[PDB]
Design a protein around this motif. Structure first.
Motif, short mmCIF file in Angstrom:
data_model
loop_
_atom_site.label_atom_id
_atom_site.label_comp_id
_atom_site.label_asym_id
_atom_site.label_seq_id
_atom_site.Cartn_x
_atom_site.Cartn_y
_atom_site.Cartn_z
N UNK A 1 0.86 -1.22 0.00
CA UNK A 1 0.00 0.00 0.00
C UNK A 1 0.88 1.25 0.00
N UNK A 2 0.73 2.10 -0.99
CA UNK A 2 1.56 3.34 -1.05
C UNK A 2 0.85 4.46 -0.29
N UNK A 3 -0.42 4.66 -0.55
CA UNK A 3 -1.17 5.74 0.15
C UNK A 3 -2.65 5.38 0.20
N UNK A 4 -3.44 6.21 0.82
CA UNK A 4 -4.90 5.94 0.89
C UNK A 4 -5.64 7.24 1.15
N UNK B 1 -3.78 2.69 -2.70
CA UNK B 1 -2.96 2.63 -3.95
C UNK B 1 -1.78 1.68 -3.74
N UNK C 1 -4.46 14.15 0.74
CA UNK C 1 -4.11 12.70 0.73
C UNK C 1 -3.34 12.35 2.01
N UNK C 2 -2.94 11.11 2.13
CA UNK C 2 -2.18 10.67 3.33
C UNK C 2 -1.24 9.54 2.89
N UNK C 3 -0.05 9.50 3.44
CA UNK C 3 0.94 8.45 3.04
C UNK C 3 1.22 7.53 4.24
N UNK C 4 2.27 6.74 4.15
CA UNK C 4 2.63 5.81 5.27
C UNK C 4 4.16 5.85 5.45
N UNK D 1 6.11 3.50 5.59
CA UNK D 1 6.74 2.48 4.70
C UNK D 1 7.49 3.17 3.56
#
Lengths: 100, 8
Positions: A52-55, A65, B2-5, B7
């Protein structure tokens, strides 16, 4: 263990163009996410949490994504698209914490 | 927005 410790969420999908919607269950694992049908309650797909890259969680739907534009994004209706993001955004912190 | 992680 296609259903052990995995949290399933009832999300609805939009078929081709049916003004209708299709219920679906989404299993969130500690290291992966799975597509579970609501009709057969069976696992239809499996994904890695590191993919999962982003959401984007909205008071109506949830989007994720895998970073693979070709595959395209995967969004569905979720009244709790936030928790699904908090439960997910929460596992990503527990897998990276043990990786230190 | 948007939002990321984390990772990376």
């Amino acid at each position: 263990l296609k259903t052990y410790g995995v949290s399933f969420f009832l999300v609805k999908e939009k078929m081709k163009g049916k003004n209708k919607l299709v219920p679906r269950l989404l299993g969130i694992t500690k290291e992966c996410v799975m597509r579970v049908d609501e009709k057969t309650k069976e696992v239809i797909q499996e994904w890695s949490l590191t993919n999962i890259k982003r959401w984007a969680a909205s008071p109506k739907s949830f989007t994720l994504d895998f970073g693979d534009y070709q595959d395209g994004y995967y969004s569905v209706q979720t009244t709790e698209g936030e928790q699904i993001a908090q439960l997910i955004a929460g596992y990503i912190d527990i897998i990276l914490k043990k990786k230190k | 927005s948007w939002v990321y992680s984390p990772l990376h």
